[PDB]
What we know:
The structure is cut from a larger assembly and holds chains A (56 residues) and B (210 residues). Chain A is mainly α and 56 residues long.
Amino acid sequence: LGDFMDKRDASIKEQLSGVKDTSSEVKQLEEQANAVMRAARAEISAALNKMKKETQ
Amino acid sequence: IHGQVLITSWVVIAILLGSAAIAVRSPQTIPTGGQNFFEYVLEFIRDVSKTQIGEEYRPWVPFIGTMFLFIFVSNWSGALLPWKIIQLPHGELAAPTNDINTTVALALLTSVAYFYAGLTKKGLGYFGKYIQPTPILLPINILEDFTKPLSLSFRLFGNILADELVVVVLVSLVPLVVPIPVMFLGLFTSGIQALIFATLAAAYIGESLE
């Protein structure tokens, strides 16, 4: 009986806690990914600036 | 055997054995009416155990919840069960706790429980009885070791047996219209003293574990 009750409690607790921690991890993922996004964007447009200045 | 208690204690233990299967009968993640009481009582075990025992509260969750819920169902069989008409020539039909032996059994169970914890988790050679804080505290060891189990039991047992007698002592004179606040106060305090035996058991385990 203790197994069954603690088991359903552990089910709901486990799923909610995993939800919250993966949410934090994917938030870290978006911050890092958009940082590298605008960094690579600066890199490509900087290659444009480089080719402009070089042909200049 | 002491029959007058054993006969009714058998059907109360039957109620217990059925509540043992009540776990595996209905699985509800969100328990509606009735089973939410089961989850709340499990939470209550969590409370008292984590508050008083300490770390290994969970393998002692069974040993505390059994006496707690058993005093609960025995209060049920004592008062709330309709038993006016039934008649037994062997003795009064009140509760499993009518005999001294059930309460001294719970006593020895709690005693050997904290003794087991204090011998395994601490050293086998010496436990809290060994006179470490002040070597002239042997009377404290003798007295506490000798007084904990029996009066630990007596605390519950006195009130429960007292009301189990008082109900029929009242009905013998006046019909049930008068004794009903007495039934009320009894159903009030019988679960409190259940909690009390539970929390004192838990405190003795915590003493053994510290």
